[PDB]
Symmetry: C2
Subunit: 137 residues, 2 copies
């Protein structure tokens, strides 16, 4: 169920916003609201928009645990006050790099990142498989 | 409509696979099966792993319309054969760059993207409010 996913994920997000110092909760709640409003105006399905918010929120919380929340805020202000869409995406990509790297520093994140690397062997073969198919084409 | 968004997503993905050149149909199917295995083992809930694959497959289909599918396949192999997790993340970041590049080249996507660049003011102020509190 769609409503089941949105519930699962928005429950996750609300917990993250409750594990934050009070005083920020109201502002985070308002940022949560208007991002959800903006994403819906994109026209992307609500499940997709909510899973995006939830995953980015999870990684925001993780990176805050390794000190990066000041850095990611400053980037967000820079992406939104930016002159063109090109520059916005670049900072968006920069923020993503910081997020994923904190997933690499986190010892549980790094444990799973290494699994994903190891279990990627059966995948490489089937990618090379059809890279081969595509060059002949 | 259908309660099972898994039913909704796999039908959507299967429609992408069913329209690829027939010579890829099976290898893609296998890729879909084992990428599900892996996400499952990353601790992702099966409703979410299936949705990720469909939303990603969507972006692959759009990037393949601008010629980039060869590049994204090569990046995938290189990332999976990287010597360390930080290398892997580096190339994964390049696959995102291609994804955003294709949303911008799509005519509907740039309209929506340009809207945010003119609909980020409200979040800018609330972000700056949070910035001041932290200081």
């Amino acid at each position: 169920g769609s409503e089941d996913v949105i519930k699962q994920a928005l429950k996750r997000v609300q917990q993250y916003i409750q594990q934050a110092p009070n005083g920020y909760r109201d502002v985070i709640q308002q940022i949560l609201q208007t991002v959800l409003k903006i994403l819906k105006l994109m026209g992307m399905p609500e499940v997709e928009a909510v899973l995006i918010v939830a995953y980015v929120a999870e990684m925001l919380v993780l990176a805050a645990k390794y000190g990066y929340i000041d850095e990611l805020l400053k980037l967000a202000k820079e992406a939104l006050e930016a002159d063109d869409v090109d520059k916005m995406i670049e900072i968006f990509l920069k923020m993503l790099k910081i997020m994923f790297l904190a997933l690499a520093l986190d010892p549980e994140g790094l444990k799973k990142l290494k699994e994903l690397k190891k279990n990627g062997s059966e995948e490489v073969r089937k990618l090379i498989e059809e890279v081969i198919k595509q060059l002949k084409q």
